[PDB]
Design a protein around this ligand. Sequence first.
Ligand SMILES: O=C(NCCc1ccc(F)cc1)c1ccco1
Length: 291
Amino acid sequence: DPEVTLLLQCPGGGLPQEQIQAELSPAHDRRPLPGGDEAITAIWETRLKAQPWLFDAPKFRLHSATLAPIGSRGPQLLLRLGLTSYRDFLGTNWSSSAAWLRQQGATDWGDTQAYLADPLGVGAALATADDFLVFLRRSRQVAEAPGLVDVPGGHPEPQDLAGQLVVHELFSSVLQEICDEVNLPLLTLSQPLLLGIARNETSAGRASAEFYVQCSLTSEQVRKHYLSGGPEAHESTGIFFVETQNVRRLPETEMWAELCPSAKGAIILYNRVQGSPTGAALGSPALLPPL
Ligand SMILES: O=C(NCCc1ccc(F)cc1)c1ccco1
């Protein structure tokens, strides 16, 4: 799967909010482009002159994520975050020249991402009360991965002492994206666990934080809520469900070729961190069938 790389796999079946620190610092920002940020301004001008209803928005930038030694007390993850924007994204990661920016970043800074916006995404492995994961079909009109299968998620917008508020907005944002797109009540959702971070190599390496969320509704109830919103209540064109039993071997199915890179990241991390039992009971052949 060359289109996705794992940057982080969380321990202990995934990390809760209270175990994560953020450092939000202008040291974690994109570096100015070698020939100047005028190239970004020029792409943005061209785009607004064809689609003048477009608007910019701030985004978090992922610089890096350091895990503590396993089994330790205290905070288990440090996220190093800067600030970027939708405009910077369109001028770097989504540029035809994005691979040239990665090579120049390697040369100048020893960092393939130094010249890339790299806005941070969130996604969820969302499980139902009857043990299915939730999948969504993308419109055939979107710029990236058109008509592909996705999971719930989005790209959160800004507004350990500013740090704890930033971790809170990240966890809050994945629940809000579930409520907005799947049309579920907030009180049917568990507090999220962070499974890990995955990079989309088809989008010049921009990362997404992948979470586990449990819903108290059945697959049939989730479907009713999604559909009862009508076509205008969601960006996706359909919803569907796969038994958690069957998610284990999804990379061997014809579905795998239809999954967008960030959804592949969510499913790989779900299988490694929530699946793959460690103990004698769940590890026994009748509960963990060989092959
Ligand atoms: O609108 C786009 N993507 C929506 C998701 C998103 C990605 C990155 C972001 F920074 C903010 C939102 C798009 C245009 C060209 C390539 O993708």
